[PDB]
RNA sequence: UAAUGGCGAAUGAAAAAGAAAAAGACCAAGUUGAUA
RNA sequence: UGGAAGUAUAAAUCGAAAAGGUGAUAGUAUUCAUCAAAGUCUAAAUAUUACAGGAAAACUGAUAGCAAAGAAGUACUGUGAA
RNA sequence: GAUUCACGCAGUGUUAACGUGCAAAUUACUUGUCAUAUUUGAGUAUAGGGGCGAAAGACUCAUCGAACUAUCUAGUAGCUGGUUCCACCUGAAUAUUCCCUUAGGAAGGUCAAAGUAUUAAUAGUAUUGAUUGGUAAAGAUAAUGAUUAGGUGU
RNA sequence: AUAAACAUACUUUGAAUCGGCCAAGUCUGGUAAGCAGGACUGGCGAUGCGGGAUGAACCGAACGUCGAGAUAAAGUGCCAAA
RNA sequence: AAUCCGACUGUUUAAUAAAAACAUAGCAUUCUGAUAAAUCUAAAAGGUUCAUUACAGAAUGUGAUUUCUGCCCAGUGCUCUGAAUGUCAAGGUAAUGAAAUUUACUUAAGCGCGGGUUAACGGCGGGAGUAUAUGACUCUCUUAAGGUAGCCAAAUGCCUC
RNA sequence: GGGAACGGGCUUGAUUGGAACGGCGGGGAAAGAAGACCCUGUUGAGCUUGACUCUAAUUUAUCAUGUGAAAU
RNA sequence: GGCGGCACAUCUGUUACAAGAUAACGCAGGUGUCCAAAGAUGAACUCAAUGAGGACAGAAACCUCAUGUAGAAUAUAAGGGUAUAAGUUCAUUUGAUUAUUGAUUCCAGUACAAUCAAUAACUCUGAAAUGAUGGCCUAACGAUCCCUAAGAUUUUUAAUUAGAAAGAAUUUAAAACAUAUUAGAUUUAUCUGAUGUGUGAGAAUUUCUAGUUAAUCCUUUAAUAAUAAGGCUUGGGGUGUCAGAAAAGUUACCACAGGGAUAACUGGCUUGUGGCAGCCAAGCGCUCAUAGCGACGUUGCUUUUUGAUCCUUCGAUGUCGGCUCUUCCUAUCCAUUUCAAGCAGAAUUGAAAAAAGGUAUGAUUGUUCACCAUUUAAUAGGGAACGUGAGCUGGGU
RNA sequence: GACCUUAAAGGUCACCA
């Protein structure tokens, strides 16, 4: 919900407790050269219409929140998942 | 089956009778590319 | 559906022109020198009814 | 089998290796022009 | 197509060469290996339920075996294909 | 494209006859109609997601809300029907999990047949001993509620 | 304490089956139902025999082919043995 | 003697419906100057209306005559002789990089924006006072328009015999 | 009576002489037809629509190099 | 069946039967969240309510004393738990972390999810023992493929220095050309022969300790490089039909496989509802509970209405009414015989024996039903597959 | 009766036989 930045948690690479900067994980830009995209583009080529199922029955309204807890002095990144919350905010 | 106007339980058209010029032969029935309709004044 | 009546008109089977008793093609005469640079005189032999 | 495939249902080769049989020759281009 | 950042063919556009192609993960470079496309022919080993001639059989023996063991694609039906 | 009769024609009614018929739509009487949007012969043209239709999804060889014929084709069927000799021995099921599952499947339980092990590998039983539980009952100024009255005190 | 060696422990492979129904010194919904749904057990299904005149479930009792006797449920005026 | 429907003559479900259904004349709307409109075909110096030329060709609704066709352009269509810098493809241009690639800019119709059109599809309201009853009158809510002229327990009215 | 809750057959009764002719329409839940109504199939078909996915026709842009010139 | 609802994933109490399991479209409710604090820890304190006091101040403002087993609070539905706390206040903090095992609940003893027990790190709080791997407990949630993020440096190698220790290495027919040097030809990115040597040749290499340099998660299959792509482990993006297709209608023109596993008609069980009948007696009946009625209650019968169920029939039992005709029931309308009256006569009313005999004609409606006009001694109510279609009709459906 | 809405009142559904 509200979780501050600048956490002090364990960093496995340094084997010590170091300050960590906390942000939010956003899905990266989908690439056009990964194997799954190249396979899908090939299948869609030609006659036959939509060759793969299209999801249309969404029911969930929220998403699980994943934080990207990053070591300040060593750039080691963790990924901690939080429960589903309607409203999320990175506080002080 | 016979016509686009071929109706149901009451003799009526059902959809507007003004159609685009680009309609395929088969559904181009009625007024075509009508800039106007109704009685002229 | 079926093929509507306007579609069946373009094939020309029973919708062909009923032109059996027609007189012919009605038109001016073919152009020539005498019509370009002179006058040709014609005589109206008769007036007929073209079906 | 490698691989392909709502990677689902299903589809799917080839070199190596072991045998039957074994066989190699031409145009074009190039050259020779008392030219055929 | 098994050929997966395109294995093969064709079409639209583009289009080489003091050669070059391939080594199936796209890209550039340097080595290495191996061939030299865009013309033609070529016996033998292989297939066969057309058809003709033969020989066989843990096959059938007249409701079986070909539809047909007799003038069987015959009698008969259909406008006709059948 | 007036009114009628006739040769003809149709099919309004009897919801008549017949209804294993004369007939895979006919017969009798009644009714209507009986030349110009008429009736009719031959030739010719139009073909199946097509034709033709004064329009009924009507007609297209007794076949039409998509003809006939042959090939794919012995199309698929969780659905219906049938499934062929004798004696002997053992002999069931409707719980549980999942499925676009509910007339059906897989895991599992019940059952049969094969094949083993000398075998820390017997119990739908009672008794003795230590427990578990909150059902029947019971209670109702014992806690939470429901409810009829009577005393005493301010 | 009682019983248990054709005891006990199984392993592998596999068939059919998961439409159920009835009874009650039982329960829930319903006015109620030869209604709908459940707990425990026994049955019918898969089951004939003796009795209840007759009856899928009730009572006695479960079945190789027979003879002789004692019986069970239940009966003994005639049909009908007593 | 009357009522309903259809104006009439005509046609129709071969084999259960012959009619109020279809056609009809009349009325109205739309597009097209012919190298067009409609439209058949896989293609085509291919084909039909067309041996034709707006008093024509093609696409529709209503259904003789009389009288009359009310209001609504918001929604969905159709259209505009209309706007550019909202959104829009393949392409084209340019930059970085060893290159693939990536990035930025620019592109048509279409939609959006604005207008027209209902003999285009269609639609055409409530509540309360007030002159023994009724309510001309008034107030109030809010539609694009609030069902107009007419007609009626109608082949259209549940209640309803 | 009981039974699948409407027997010609079973149980208990009533009752019965063999063969049948002309009628008849009570019964044989008479015959005709793998219910056309309803429901179930992960069985279809005709028709409709901004149901999903496509498609002919229509339409717009680029490419496909005729000459000789000018404007941006 | 549809419409309605979700008993489809899921929690609490109850039905539910004192182990475990456990039904109904049974009952009363609940979830798709919320929380940097409402997580962790340490310390201090005690709540609701009541009584008695205190200027404004009163029933309710703030202060004090006493009683006070929780009657308060604990995010939420309900049920459990909680008093030097699990509640209130204060303070520190991030264990709501990384890695590895073994179990328990659903369970097929599969997955997801959840619940625990330990171990190795680094931390938090506390003086310390302890406590801390999210919320006091029981719900608060998710496969394969695909997309998208984080991680794999602890270690292993090669080369060269210094030191040390073991080490014979296999044996005859040769072409690629790196080239020089000449014999020809050429002007263009110039080529074409032959003579020649080495190359490439064979009768050192490894280990190890200390350095230095470099590389270091695997793969793209002839060898490397920087890009790109693919692997391995772990999260997120989601399927609510919640073990997870990508999906609008209508057929009265309809078709097929089937079904009494399932509706529309009879029949069968029930009798709410409909009809009929009783028991008591508050009262009405001018006086009088019972001539005739009988409230508040209560007990029945019938299958002539409609319900409720789905046992029989879906390879078919012809589905309303009327017409014709026969029979049966009595809960009797008339005729016959009787008793009673608030029966003077007449006309009536209540009841008993009795079902052998009679119980009509028309207008409107397809009607059953109903309502009118007559007549009659009376113009009663019902059953027989809602009697009766190879008996009719076809008005309705 | 069922669903929805307002401050009791309305609105839609009540179908195949």
Structure determined by: cryo-EM
The secondary element (H helix, E strand) that includes residue A65 is: strand A64-71
CB contact set of A70 (below 8 Å; sequence gap of 6+): A20, A21, A22, A23, A76, A77, A78
Bridge partners for A10 per DSSP: A17
Which ranges of chain A would DSSP assign to H, the alpha helix?
35-44
Say what the resolution is, in angstroms.
Answer: 3.0
Beta-carbon neighbour count of residue A67 at 10 Å?
20
User: Gaps (C–N > 2.5 Å) in chain A: which residues precede them?
Assistant: none
Identify the CA nearest to B37 among candidates B11, B12, B9, B18: B18
Question: Whose structure tokens read 């007024």?
Answer: B31
Which pair of tokens denotes residue A80?
Answer: 């901690």
Which pair of tokens denotes residue C29?
Answer: 């005469």
DSSP label at A29? P
Check if residue A16 sits with its Cβ under 7 angstroms from strand D.
no
Which of chain C's residues have a Cβ under 8 Å away from the Cβ of B2? 1-2, 4
C8 at the B interface (CB within 8 A)?
A: no
Q: Between β-strands A16-24 and A64-71, what pairing exists: parallel, antiparallel or unpaired?
A: antiparallel
Residue B19 Cα distances to A1, B4, B8, B13, B24, angstroms: 56, 12, 21, 13, 10
8 Å CB contact between C5 and B4: no
Rounded (5°) CA angle B1-B15-C4: 30
CB hemisphere CA count around B8 (13 angstroms): 3
Say which nucleotide is closest to residue A86, CA to C1' distance.
J33
8 Å CB contact between A22 and A5: yes
């Amino acid at each position: 919900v509200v979780v501050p930045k600048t956490r002090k948690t364990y960093c496995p690479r340094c084997d010590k407790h170091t300050p960590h900067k906390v942000s939010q994980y956003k899905k990266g830009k989908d690439s056009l050269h990964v194997q799954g995209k190249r396979r899908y583009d090939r299948k869609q080529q030609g006659f036959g219409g939509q060759t793969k199922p299209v999801f249309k029955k969404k029911a969930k309204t929220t998403k699980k929140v994943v934080l990207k807890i990053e070591c300040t002095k060593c750039k080691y990144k963790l990924q901690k998942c939080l429960k589903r919350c309607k409203h999320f905010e990175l506080g002080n | 089956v016979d016509h686009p106007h071929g109706g149901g339980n009451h003799q009526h058209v059902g959809h507007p009778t003004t159609l685009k010029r680009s309609s395929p032969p088969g559904q181009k029935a009625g007024k075509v590319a009508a800039r106007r309709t109704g009685l002229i004044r | 559906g079926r093929r509507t009546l306007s579609q069946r008109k373009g094939r020309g089977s029973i919708f062909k022109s009923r032109s059996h008793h027609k007189l012919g093609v009605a038109q001016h005469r073919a152009i020539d020198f005498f019509e370009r640079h002179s006058t040709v005189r014609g005589l109206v032999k008769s007036i007929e009814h073209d079906p």
